[PDB]
Amino acid sequence: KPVCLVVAMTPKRGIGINNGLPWPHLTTDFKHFSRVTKTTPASRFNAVVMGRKTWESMPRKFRPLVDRLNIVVSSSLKEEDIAAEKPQAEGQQRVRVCASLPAALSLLEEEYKDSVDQIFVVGGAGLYEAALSLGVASHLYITRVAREFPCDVFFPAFPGDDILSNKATYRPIFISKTFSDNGVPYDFVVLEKRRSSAAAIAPVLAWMDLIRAVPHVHFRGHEEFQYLDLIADIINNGRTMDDRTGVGVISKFGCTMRYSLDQAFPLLTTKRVFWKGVLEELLWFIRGDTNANHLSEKGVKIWDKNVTREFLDSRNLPHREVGDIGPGYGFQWRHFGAAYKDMHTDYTGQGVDQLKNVIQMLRTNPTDRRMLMTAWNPAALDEMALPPCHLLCQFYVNDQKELSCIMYQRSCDVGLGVPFNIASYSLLTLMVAHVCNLKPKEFIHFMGNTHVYTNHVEALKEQLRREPRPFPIVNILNKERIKEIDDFTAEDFEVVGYVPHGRIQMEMAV
Amino acid sequence: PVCLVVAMTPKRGIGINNGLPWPHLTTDFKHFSRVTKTTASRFNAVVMGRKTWESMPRKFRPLVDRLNIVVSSSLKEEDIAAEKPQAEGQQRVRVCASLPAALSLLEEEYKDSVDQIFVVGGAGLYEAALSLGVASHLYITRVAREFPCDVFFPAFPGDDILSNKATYRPIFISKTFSDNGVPYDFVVLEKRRSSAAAIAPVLAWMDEELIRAVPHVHFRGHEEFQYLDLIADIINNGRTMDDRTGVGVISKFGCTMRYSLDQAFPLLTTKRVFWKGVLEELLWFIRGDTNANHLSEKGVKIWDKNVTREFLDSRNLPHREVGDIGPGYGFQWRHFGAAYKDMHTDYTGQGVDQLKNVIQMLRTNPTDRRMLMTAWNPAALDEMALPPCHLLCQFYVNDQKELSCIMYQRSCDVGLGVPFNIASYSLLTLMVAHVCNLKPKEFIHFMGNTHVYTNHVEALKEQLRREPRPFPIVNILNKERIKEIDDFTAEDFEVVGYVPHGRIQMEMAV
Ligand SMILES: NC(=O)C1=CN([C@@H]2O[C@H](COP(=O)(O)OP(=O)(O)OC[C@H]3O[C@@H](n4cnc5c(N)ncnc54)[C@H](OP(=O)(O)O)[C@@H]3O)[C@@H](O)[C@H]2O)C=CC1
Ligand SMILES: NC(=O)C1=CN([C@@H]2O[C@H](COP(=O)(O)OP(=O)(O)OC[C@H]3O[C@@H](n4cnc5c(N)ncnc54)[C@H](OP(=O)(O)O)[C@@H]3O)[C@@H](O)[C@H]2O)C=CC1
Ligand SMILES: C#CCN(Cc1ccc2[nH]c(N)nc(=O)c2c1)c1ccc(C(=O)N[C@@H](CCC(=O)O)C(=O)O)cc1
Ligand SMILES: C#CCN(Cc1ccc2[nH]c(N)nc(=O)c2c1)c1ccc(C(=O)N[C@@H](CCC(=O)O)C(=O)O)cc1
Ligand SMILES: Cc1ncc(-c2cccc(N3CCN(c4cnc(N)nc4N)CC3)c2)cn1
Ligand SMILES: Cc1ncc(-c2cccc(N3CCN(c4cnc(N)nc4N)CC3)c2)cn1
Ligand SMILES: O=c1ccn([C@H]2C[C@H](O)[C@@H](COP(=O)(O)O)O2)c(=O)[nH]1
Ligand SMILES: O=c1ccn([C@H]2C[C@H](O)[C@@H](COP(=O)(O)O)O2)c(=O)[nH]1
């Protein structure tokens, strides 16, 4: 009696154009559709109910949908029209035609009470709209396509449609990890209409034996749940400490996350991440550049507060020009151990080029276990505006030419920095994979002092009420031009299908 | 349906002079109470021998909320009537002439009143119960230290759970506890001879999918299961690769373990770990010593194969004397960045003493987030006999003056090195805690390239068939004398209650 809806949908609720699908073929989505509509426990089949145009949109070879009772809602098509279109295969059910959705559901009760198990409404907008109006839909199986495409047909507005993009309810109980086919990111959600072996162990367990992110979500496949759960874990279980800043901190020690890079890109969705910032900083690092004015001048001000006259003096660096971070990250990457003078100097050929070494080892001997890059130079710390937070990274290639990367971070501002750090090293992994002819597989985040500032806790709690959106894809453009790590520009990247929730203001502790 | 509850030394010792052999173990008593009390209006019964009844302090006898039965021919029910004032709600103590009689009485006069029957000592009752074959389960507290005893729990098939020599197999192994300088743990042996319905179909298509360590053990509380499961995980899921050595490897990337240091010490038990080796190497590191002959001369040969004329030449270090590891681990700890000459040189005051800095920061500003030590100096790598494996560690103090330590290891020989590395940095944590007036809490192991050599897999599979024993305690002796990190000697340590399985020979891949 209670129907399910099954649908794939752009963020703007688009489902169709020109009586076809808006996107190229999404293989995994089709598998899912088939598997959800066919699978059943009994001589009980499922029924699929569809509109006339949806029936017409389907290629002849696939229609009628096999092993499923097909019902078409139409006032023009007759059952004989359909029977005449293609010969009924033995064992399959003869396609029914009904005048409306109510009629289709009556027919299912009247003529098929003992025959059908589940009822699926499978489009188009006519049927989705009616089903929601009648209030007979218990569950929505929604494939969220993260890219927008030209569409002329749309899934109707519904309470809970904030799962799709920014503006009885339908709340998500299931959010998968991000898939991709043909350069299209997407994921799967399910919404629900809302409004004496063990007996011997038991007594010993008994004596031996709160903030949660979107707790209604039971299957937490989306990899962003690692970040969301880490926020909750620190707030619930962390310890309140003082620190350098004078601001409060709640901290934990020794934390881990890992993000797939093969299908999509972990640009967190639960608040907008400053992508221009990640890209510009990483290119700056790669250059060995220590002049934060080069960032500031492009609208990336992340380093400004730590390179003021004031902050440099608090660090006993009176001789530093404003903007000079000293021998920080990129300097140690490209010139480890070289004698620093200032940000204006040519250091070409001084010290160890760790990045070159890593790349050359990846290209020639990828089973080597010493493919590390470090920014932590105890001899140079006092000369830096700030000791590095992300201080070491290690590369690994498997049997399939898949590249993984670990980064160790001594100090993790979970609220502000962590999302930015995830994106930064995930991007570096993409860039290195490309230049070494490898496939990016995984970014692995190892975290030391993992903390949330006290002045962030109330904003972070709001963030935890948001369900994640599918991750976008990052494409490297102009691959043919790009042969070395130094070749990348700010323009050779495309972020595809990024649909985050709004910015949340969070003040940087200087 | 009877269960035995007992605490026992590795040699099966239970008693001396009609008392317990050990000082009071608080957690064991909690456990005993909780197991025997926890349950309708149905109580548990405890059955005990006369001497056991006499051994118990009057304040605790009879055992509250439990039907007490004493097995004796000399003692009388009436004696207990007037021995002590009887509370309402509690059951009158019964006396029976034998264990068979106690069990008959339970059937005859307490058919439905009682749930579980517990035999609670002493050797008279344990022996009878095992002879009758009426015991289904053993609740055994394994005391890891040996004590003078005159009374022993009987030999039983499966008593190899206690020390090295119808069956009793362990189904439960807890983590290691300690009270009054006594390590112990808890085992249980068993006598042998539509929210989810909507999610279901989507989960089914998403999973399109075997070594296990002592699989009969269902509750896997012992922290050594992290190591055992990591072995299994690599063998099951790892990828076969070549490597530097020419030997096969099966590898994974990005692995984690963490070990409590507050109660006991993670010296793995499933094979004997070379403790003299860990202690001597760590002291050597702390000295800044780079002469492996100093280790070799004490019977610690771990560095010999990597400091031969042959190996040094394969590394293009002809000018190195045999035994000179170059500017490796301890050199970088105590003298980061100093110009190396040879192992005979005084480097006092050259480079950065990272260990001193960490300790001074712990003693003066323990909320600082830069308490790191690194051995990874890209400028010096080519001069080293071997690039360091354990390359970075970070310290952390919470609000309770508890010290935790993270160590990052780029390359992990799971078979040979890992157990040794766990012990090494856990020990360093103890030493640092003491000298900084802190309480050791936790060692956290972060692992990069995590591998098992192919020529170890056969031996590792044997290792996985062994149940872990309780972890020992490591005590620092002569605490009063020891005020700085340099003060420790090879003699200021005591390892208490270590009862590992036998050595397993595993060749070092050179
Ligand atoms: N991305 C996705 O998940 C999905 C994509 N699609 C796309 O959607 C499009 C087709 O959907 P759409 O254009 O909305 O057409 P529909 O599938 O809704 O079919 C429209 C026709 O069906 C009949 N009908 C529908 N609703 C009613 C109603 N309430 N009462 C009576 N008759 C009704 C009428 O047939 P008649 O006029 O003969 O009486 C009507 O003209 C295509 O582009 C297709 O590719 C389809 C399914 C899902
Ligand atoms: N570590 C642990 O977990 C525990 C250890 N203990 C220790 O054990 C010691 C006492 O144990 P133990 O010396 O064996 O004494 P018991 O407590 O077993 O009592 C022995 C007496 O019980 C009676 N009895 C024993 N066996 C039988 C039998 N098969 N049939 C009939 N009557 C029997 C006899 O008294 P009678 O002649 O009157 O019948 C015998 O002298 C103490 O040191 C105590 O601290 C005790 C509890 C648990
Ligand atoms: C990490 C790192 C590099 N850094 C450097 C940097 C320097 C000092 C720091 N200090 C503290 N206390 N926390 C930090 O995260 C931090 C980060 C950054 C600094 C600022 C922003 C920032 O202003 N954030 C963006 C939004 C980014 C996001 O969504 O997370 C903004 O517009 O505010 C980002 C990165
Ligand atoms: C890590 C580390 C220290 N080290 C240093 C060290 C040096 C080179 C290495 N090389 C390789 N390939 N694997 C290693 O584990 C390794 C370890 C060790 C070296 C040897 C032994 C050894 O031959 N067996 C020990 C058993 C110790 C144990 O139980 O783990 C013995 O008793 O001889 C142990 C530790
Ligand atoms: C190239 C191509 N074009 C179309 C199809 C195809 C085959 C069978 C059915 C369909 N439909 C397209 C829309 N459908 C659908 C697809 N995906 C979800 N999640 N829900 C749906 N209702 C079911 C109907 C499309 C397969 N391959
Ligand atoms: C100082 C002190 N001395 C003795 C006791 C005490 C109190 C009640 C009972 C006992 N027993 C000691 C040994 N017992 C026991 C203890 N622990 C386990 N695991 N099994 C057991 N059977 C039960 C008998 C000991 C408590 N406190
Ligand atoms: O890439 C970065 C740079 C900085 N920080 C944060 C961590 C701390 O909150 C702060 C630096 O303070 P200390 O860890 O140096 O005390 O900046 C990050 O999280 N990531
Ligand atoms: O403390 C140590 C030192 C060495 N190794 C092992 C790891 C590797 O098997 C080998 C080092 O060889 P490379 O990682 O340099 O290839 O020694 C350890 O596990 N722990």
CSV table of N, CA, C and O in Angstrom, one decimal, chain B residues 254-319:
chain,number,residue,atom,x,y,z
B,254,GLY,N,49.1,3.3,5.9
B,254,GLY,CA,48.3,4.1,6.9
B,254,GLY,C,47.7,3.2,7.9
B,254,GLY,O,46.5,2.8,7.7
B,255,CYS,N,48.4,2.9,9.0
B,255,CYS,CA,47.9,2.0,10.1
B,255,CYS,C,48.1,2.6,11.4
B,255,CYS,O,49.0,3.4,11.6
B,256,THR,N,47.3,2.2,12.4
B,256,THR,CA,47.2,2.8,13.7
B,256,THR,C,47.1,1.8,14.8
B,256,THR,O,46.3,0.9,14.6
B,257,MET,N,47.8,2.0,15.9
B,257,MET,CA,47.5,1.2,17.2
B,257,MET,C,47.6,2.2,18.3
B,257,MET,O,48.3,3.2,18.2
B,258,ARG,N,47.0,1.9,19.4
B,258,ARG,CA,47.3,2.7,20.6
B,258,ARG,C,47.3,1.9,21.9
B,258,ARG,O,46.3,1.1,22.1
B,259,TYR,N,48.2,2.1,22.8
B,259,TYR,CA,48.4,1.2,24.0
B,259,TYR,C,48.4,2.1,25.3
B,259,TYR,O,49.1,3.1,25.4
B,260,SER,N,47.6,1.6,26.2
B,260,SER,CA,47.5,2.2,27.6
B,260,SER,C,48.8,2.0,28.3
B,260,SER,O,49.4,0.9,28.2
B,261,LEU,N,49.3,3.0,29.0
B,261,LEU,CA,50.5,2.9,29.8
B,261,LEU,C,50.3,3.1,31.3
B,261,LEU,O,51.2,3.0,32.1
B,262,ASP,N,49.0,3.4,31.7
B,262,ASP,CA,48.7,3.7,33.1
B,262,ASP,C,48.7,2.5,34.0
B,262,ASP,O,49.1,2.6,35.1
B,263,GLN,N,48.2,1.3,33.5
B,263,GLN,CA,48.1,0.1,34.3
B,263,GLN,C,49.2,-0.9,34.1
B,263,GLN,O,49.7,-1.4,35.1
B,264,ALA,N,49.5,-1.1,32.8
B,264,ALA,CA,50.5,-2.1,32.4
B,264,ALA,C,51.4,-1.6,31.3
B,264,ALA,O,51.2,-0.5,30.8
B,265,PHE,N,52.2,-2.5,30.8
B,265,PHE,CA,53.2,-2.1,29.8
B,265,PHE,C,53.1,-3.1,28.6
B,265,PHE,O,53.1,-4.3,28.7
B,266,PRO,N,52.9,-2.5,27.3
B,266,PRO,CA,52.7,-3.3,26.2
B,266,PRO,C,53.9,-4.1,25.6
B,266,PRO,O,54.4,-3.8,24.5
B,267,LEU,N,54.4,-5.0,26.4
B,267,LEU,CA,55.4,-5.9,25.9
B,267,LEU,C,54.7,-7.1,25.4
B,267,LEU,O,54.1,-7.9,26.2
B,268,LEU,N,54.6,-7.3,24.1
B,268,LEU,CA,53.8,-8.4,23.5
B,268,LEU,C,54.1,-9.8,24.0
B,268,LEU,O,55.3,-10.1,24.3
B,269,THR,N,53.1,-10.6,24.1
B,269,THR,CA,53.1,-11.8,24.9
B,269,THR,C,53.1,-13.0,24.0
B,269,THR,O,53.1,-14.2,24.5
B,270,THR,N,52.7,-12.8,22.8
B,270,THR,CA,52.4,-13.9,21.9
B,270,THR,C,53.7,-14.4,21.3
B,270,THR,O,53.6,-15.5,20.7
B,271,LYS,N,54.7,-13.7,21.4
B,271,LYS,CA,56.1,-14.2,21.4
B,271,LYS,C,57.0,-13.4,22.3
B,271,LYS,O,56.7,-12.2,22.4
B,272,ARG,N,58.1,-14.0,22.8
B,272,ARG,CA,59.0,-13.2,23.7
B,272,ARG,C,59.6,-12.1,22.9
B,272,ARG,O,60.2,-12.3,21.9
B,273,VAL,N,59.6,-10.9,23.5
B,273,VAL,CA,60.2,-9.7,22.9
B,273,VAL,C,61.6,-9.5,23.6
B,273,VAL,O,61.7,-9.7,24.8
B,274,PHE,N,62.6,-9.1,22.8
B,274,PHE,CA,64.0,-8.9,23.3
B,274,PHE,C,64.1,-7.6,24.1
B,274,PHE,O,64.6,-6.6,23.6
B,275,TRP,N,63.7,-7.7,25.4
B,275,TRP,CA,63.6,-6.5,26.3
B,275,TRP,C,65.0,-5.9,26.5
B,275,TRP,O,65.1,-4.6,26.6
B,276,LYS,N,66.0,-6.7,26.7
B,276,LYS,CA,67.4,-6.2,26.9
B,276,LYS,C,67.7,-5.3,25.7
B,276,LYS,O,68.3,-4.3,25.8
B,277,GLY,N,67.3,-5.8,24.5
B,277,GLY,CA,67.5,-5.1,23.3
B,277,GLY,C,66.8,-3.8,23.2
B,277,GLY,O,67.4,-2.8,22.8
B,278,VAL,N,65.6,-3.7,23.7
B,278,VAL,CA,64.8,-2.4,23.6
B,278,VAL,C,65.5,-1.4,24.5
B,278,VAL,O,65.7,-0.3,24.2
B,279,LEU,N,65.8,-1.9,25.7
B,279,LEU,CA,66.3,-1.0,26.8
B,279,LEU,C,67.7,-0.5,26.4
B,279,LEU,O,67.9,0.7,26.5
B,280,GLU,N,68.5,-1.4,25.9
B,280,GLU,CA,69.9,-1.0,25.5
B,280,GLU,C,69.9,0.0,24.4
B,280,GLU,O,70.7,0.9,24.4
B,281,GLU,N,69.1,-0.3,23.4
B,281,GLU,CA,69.0,0.6,22.2
B,281,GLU,C,68.5,2.0,22.5
B,281,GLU,O,69.0,3.0,22.0
B,282,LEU,N,67.5,2.1,23.4
B,282,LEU,CA,66.9,3.4,23.8
B,282,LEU,C,67.9,4.2,24.6
B,282,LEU,O,68.0,5.4,24.3
B,283,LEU,N,68.6,3.6,25.5
B,283,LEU,CA,69.7,4.3,26.2
B,283,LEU,C,70.8,4.8,25.3
B,283,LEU,O,71.2,5.9,25.5
B,284,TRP,N,71.1,4.0,24.3
B,284,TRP,CA,72.1,4.3,23.3
B,284,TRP,C,71.6,5.5,22.4
B,284,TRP,O,72.4,6.4,22.2
B,285,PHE,N,70.4,5.5,22.0
B,285,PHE,CA,69.7,6.7,21.3
B,285,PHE,C,69.9,7.9,22.2
B,285,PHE,O,70.2,9.0,21.7
B,286,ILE,N,69.5,7.8,23.4
B,286,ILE,CA,69.5,9.0,24.3
B,286,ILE,C,70.8,9.6,24.5
B,286,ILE,O,71.0,10.8,24.6
B,287,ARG,N,71.9,8.7,24.4
B,287,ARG,CA,73.3,9.2,24.5
B,287,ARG,C,73.7,10.0,23.3
B,287,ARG,O,74.8,10.6,23.3
B,288,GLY,N,73.0,9.8,22.2
B,288,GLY,CA,73.5,10.4,20.9
B,288,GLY,C,74.5,9.5,20.3
B,288,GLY,O,75.2,9.9,19.4
B,289,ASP,N,74.6,8.2,20.7
B,289,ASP,CA,75.7,7.3,20.3
B,289,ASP,C,75.4,6.7,18.9
B,289,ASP,O,74.2,6.3,18.6
B,290,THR,N,76.4,6.7,18.1
B,290,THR,CA,76.2,6.2,16.7
B,290,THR,C,77.2,5.0,16.5
B,290,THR,O,77.4,4.7,15.3
B,291,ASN,N,77.7,4.4,17.5
B,291,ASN,CA,78.6,3.3,17.4
B,291,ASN,C,77.9,2.0,17.8
B,291,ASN,O,77.7,1.7,19.0
B,292,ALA,N,77.5,1.2,16.8
B,292,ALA,CA,76.7,0.0,17.0
B,292,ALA,C,77.5,-1.1,17.7
B,292,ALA,O,76.9,-2.1,18.2
B,293,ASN,N,78.8,-0.9,17.8
B,293,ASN,CA,79.7,-1.9,18.5
B,293,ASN,C,79.4,-1.8,20.0
B,293,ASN,O,79.6,-2.8,20.7
B,294,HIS,N,79.0,-0.7,20.5
B,294,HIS,CA,78.6,-0.5,21.9
B,294,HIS,C,77.4,-1.3,22.2
B,294,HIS,O,77.3,-1.8,23.3
B,295,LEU,N,76.5,-1.6,21.2
B,295,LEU,CA,75.4,-2.4,21.4
B,295,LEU,C,75.8,-3.9,21.2
B,295,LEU,O,75.5,-4.7,22.1
B,296,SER,N,76.5,-4.2,20.2
B,296,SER,CA,77.0,-5.5,19.8
B,296,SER,C,77.8,-6.1,21.0
B,296,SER,O,77.6,-7.3,21.3
B,297,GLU,N,78.5,-5.3,21.7
B,297,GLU,CA,79.4,-5.7,22.8
B,297,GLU,C,78.6,-6.1,24.1
B,297,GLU,O,79.1,-6.9,24.9
B,298,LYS,N,77.3,-5.7,24.1
B,298,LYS,CA,76.4,-6.1,25.2
B,298,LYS,C,75.5,-7.2,24.8
B,298,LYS,O,74.6,-7.5,25.6
B,299,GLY,N,75.7,-7.8,23.7
B,299,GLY,CA,74.8,-8.9,23.2
B,299,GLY,C,73.6,-8.4,22.5
B,299,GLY,O,72.7,-9.2,22.3
B,300,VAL,N,73.6,-7.2,22.0
B,300,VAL,CA,72.5,-6.6,21.2
B,300,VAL,C,73.0,-6.4,19.8
B,300,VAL,O,73.7,-5.3,19.5
B,301,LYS,N,72.6,-7.3,18.9
B,301,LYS,CA,73.3,-7.3,17.6
B,301,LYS,C,72.4,-6.8,16.5
B,301,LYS,O,72.7,-6.8,15.3
B,302,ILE,N,71.3,-6.1,16.9
B,302,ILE,CA,70.2,-5.6,16.0
B,302,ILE,C,70.8,-4.7,14.9
B,302,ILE,O,70.2,-4.6,13.8
B,303,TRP,N,71.9,-4.0,15.1
B,303,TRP,CA,72.5,-3.1,14.1
B,303,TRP,C,73.6,-3.7,13.3
B,303,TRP,O,74.1,-3.0,12.3
B,304,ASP,N,74.0,-4.9,13.6
B,304,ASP,CA,75.3,-5.4,13.0
B,304,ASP,C,75.3,-5.6,11.5
B,304,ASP,O,76.3,-5.2,10.9
B,305,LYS,N,74.2,-6.1,11.0
B,305,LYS,CA,74.0,-6.4,9.6
B,305,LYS,C,74.0,-5.2,8.7
B,305,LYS,O,74.3,-5.3,7.5
B,306,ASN,N,73.6,-4.0,9.3
B,306,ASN,CA,73.5,-2.8,8.6
B,306,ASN,C,74.7,-1.9,8.8
B,306,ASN,O,74.8,-0.8,8.3
B,307,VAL,N,75.8,-2.4,9.5
B,307,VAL,CA,77.0,-1.7,9.7
B,307,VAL,C,78.2,-2.4,9.3
B,307,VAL,O,79.3,-2.1,9.7
B,308,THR,N,78.1,-3.5,8.5
B,308,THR,CA,79.2,-4.3,8.0
B,308,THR,C,79.9,-3.5,6.9
B,308,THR,O,79.4,-2.5,6.3
B,309,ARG,N,81.2,-3.9,6.6
B,309,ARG,CA,82.0,-3.3,5.5
B,309,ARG,C,81.1,-3.4,4.3
B,309,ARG,O,81.0,-2.4,3.5
B,310,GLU,N,80.5,-4.5,4.0
B,310,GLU,CA,79.7,-4.8,2.9
B,310,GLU,C,78.6,-3.9,2.7
B,310,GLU,O,78.3,-3.3,1.6
B,311,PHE,N,77.8,-3.8,3.8
B,311,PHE,CA,76.5,-3.0,3.7
B,311,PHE,C,76.9,-1.5,3.5
B,311,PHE,O,76.2,-0.8,2.8
B,312,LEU,N,77.9,-1.0,4.3
B,312,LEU,CA,78.3,0.4,4.2
B,312,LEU,C,78.7,0.7,2.8
B,312,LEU,O,78.4,1.8,2.3
B,313,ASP,N,79.4,-0.2,2.1
B,313,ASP,CA,79.9,0.0,0.7
B,313,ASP,C,78.7,0.1,-0.3
B,313,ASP,O,78.7,0.9,-1.2
B,314,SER,N,77.7,-0.8,0.0
B,314,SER,CA,76.5,-0.9,-0.9
B,314,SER,C,75.8,0.5,-0.8
B,314,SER,O,74.9,0.8,-1.7
B,315,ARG,N,76.2,1.3,0.2
B,315,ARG,CA,75.5,2.5,0.5
B,315,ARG,C,76.5,3.7,0.1
B,315,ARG,O,76.2,4.8,0.4
B,316,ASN,N,77.5,3.3,-0.6
B,316,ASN,CA,78.6,4.3,-1.0
B,316,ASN,C,79.1,5.0,0.2
B,316,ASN,O,79.3,6.3,0.2
B,317,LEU,N,79.4,4.3,1.3
B,317,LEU,CA,80.1,4.9,2.5
B,317,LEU,C,81.3,4.1,2.8
B,317,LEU,O,81.4,3.5,3.8
B,318,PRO,N,82.3,4.1,1.8
B,318,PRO,CA,83.6,3.4,2.1
B,318,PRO,C,84.4,4.0,3.3
B,318,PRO,O,85.1,3.3,3.9
B,319,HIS,N,84.2,5.3,3.5
B,319,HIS,CA,85.0,6.0,4.6
B,319,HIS,C,84.5,5.7,6.0
B,319,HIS,O,85.2,6.2,6.9
